[PDB]
Nucleic acid binder design. Structure first.
Length: 74
RNA sequence: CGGGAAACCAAAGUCUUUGGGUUCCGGGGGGAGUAUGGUUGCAAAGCUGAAACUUAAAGGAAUUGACGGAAGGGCACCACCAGGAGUGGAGCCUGCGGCUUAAUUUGACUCAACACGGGAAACCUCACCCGGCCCGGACACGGACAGGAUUGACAGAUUGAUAGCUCUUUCUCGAUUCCGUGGGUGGUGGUGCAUGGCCGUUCUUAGUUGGUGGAGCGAUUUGUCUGGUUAAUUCCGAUAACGAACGAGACUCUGGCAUGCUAACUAGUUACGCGACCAACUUCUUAGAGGGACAAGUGGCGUUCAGCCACCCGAGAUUGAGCAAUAACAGGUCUGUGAUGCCCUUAGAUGUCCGGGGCUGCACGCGCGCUACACUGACUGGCUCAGCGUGUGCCUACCCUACGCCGGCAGGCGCGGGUAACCCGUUGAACCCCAUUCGUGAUGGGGAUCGGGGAUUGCAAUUAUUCCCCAUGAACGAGGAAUUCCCAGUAAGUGCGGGUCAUAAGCUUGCGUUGAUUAAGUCCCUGCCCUUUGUACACACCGCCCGU
């Protein structure tokens, strides 16, 4: 009988903290400075979500989790 | 009388009611009858004879127990036996220590540990484990609000892993929470040397205890015993004991027996019955108010008592088990239980998630296990065979099973029955037998691996699940030292069913089937009990104790 001796890797770990900025700079912008503005996200043609569901942007396969939708030309 | 602590003593009496005369002599135990001085002796040694120091007892009598390589009498296959049978070595892997790093992993140190925790380890139960994350505070004090992170992406990877952990997106319940110390909603966290309750054992034997009365100053003893008898502290009897109380017996369950009884459309049936001249008042099975066996009859042994032996008769003539006395043990269990008293670690909570190394090695460190020697062992498939039992929703998603795809049958799919004496099933890949056979024993006779036919369908099985055939030839016919169990439906062979479970068994708990050589004795070994005796033991012989 010995101990588990789980020490050889990762003696201490730091909590991950996402630096989610409180200001609307990276997520959205207007680039117009007017009452009417242009939206920087493609319209979602699916009816399985709400009328204000706006998709985020990655390198590909825009990840939202609810749909896992990917733009494909079939 | 009397006296003594008593053992005992007519003296060890005439003693606190103390004085007949007189001599020697002791003052806790050791040091020590030692040192020294004197004295005697040829010598060995004799006589007289300290102290320093050391110690809380040493010692006497007796009482109970324990022990005895002490006696007497009994008893037990956890004992033995010119007795044996089967053994641990010849056919189905597990438990824990010896025993390389992720491998020898908690509790249990002879009987009273070691398929034991009903503990059959991938994993939820793995703490030896190559690796982590979602993390805890009714409060004592600290860091301060529309952000101070939650299991939650294949393709550049991870250390196996469709786990965002990649030094990665600034997707996503959204005020949920987090760090430093513990009480806490607790921890299968410690301590079973704090406990309860359950067990196990001393201890399977017959043992044990008041009341009142006797004995003793008393601890204590008698009762509870010289004998005979019994399996028995069972009885007869004896008797300073008499009356009692437990334990033993009785008792309960279970087997074994009815030209008897109570009755069954699930076993069982009678001449105005057919499908055949060419609505039995219940008995085999099932189960009930009863019966039956009492050493009852006879013979012989026994202060002619208790009882013992034998024999008819009888289904059966010490007949399976269960339950089981206070004191006991620092026996096991805190890991069965918001059954339960607090000294006290860590974030790598002994929580989850078909996820994941071992232990399924072979110079064995041990223990429980898996196995029959010949016309008896097994095939012709040529006659009606057994059980004991189990079987489908609070939880819950998991039950037992009756035809065909067809190679040759469980069976990958359709199919009905059974909450059960209704179905499985008069228990669906089974006797031990036999026109495949041994002529005197390595052949046909019982299998060393290990390969194919469709695999029950369990991710994995190999780091435990899953059939018989080609006859490929293994010391191929009573076994180191040490030994374990056992006396009639014992043993042993053999299969089957329950528990565990997913029909998971080499384990255990039960059940039938074939069927039994030896013994109706003993105290030799190991122990136990009813006495007497000894003890310088009482932590009780694993004791105590002596020696430079």
């Amino acid at each position: 009988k010995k101990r588990k001796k789980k020490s050889y890797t990762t003696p201490k770990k730091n909590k991950h903290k996402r630096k989610k900025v409180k200001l609307a700079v990276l997520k959205y912008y207007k680039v117009d400075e007017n009452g009417k503005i242009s939206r920087l996200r493609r319209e979602c043609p699916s009816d399985e979500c709400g009328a204000g569901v706006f998709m985020a942007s990655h390198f590909d396969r825009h990840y939202c989790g609810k749909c896992c939708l990917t733009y494909c030309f079939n």
